[PDB]
Amino acid sequence: FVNQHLCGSHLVEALYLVCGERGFFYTPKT
Amino acid sequence: GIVEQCCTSICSLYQLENYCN
Lengths: 30, 21
Known about the structure:
The structure holds two protein chains of two kinds.
Chain A: H1 9-19
Chain B: H1 2-7, H2 13-17
Organism (chain A): Homo sapiens (Human)
Protein name (chain A): Insulin B chain
């Protein structure tokens, strides 16, 4: 499910699912 | 950043994992 364009809340969702117990850092700066 | 790699271009597991803690 990760191999697509993922934007906004969908991208956050993907990080949430992938990273699990590790958590993650999200910065939309680009 | 992640937006450039996953939003405006196609994302990958490799890339997403870069942002896990």
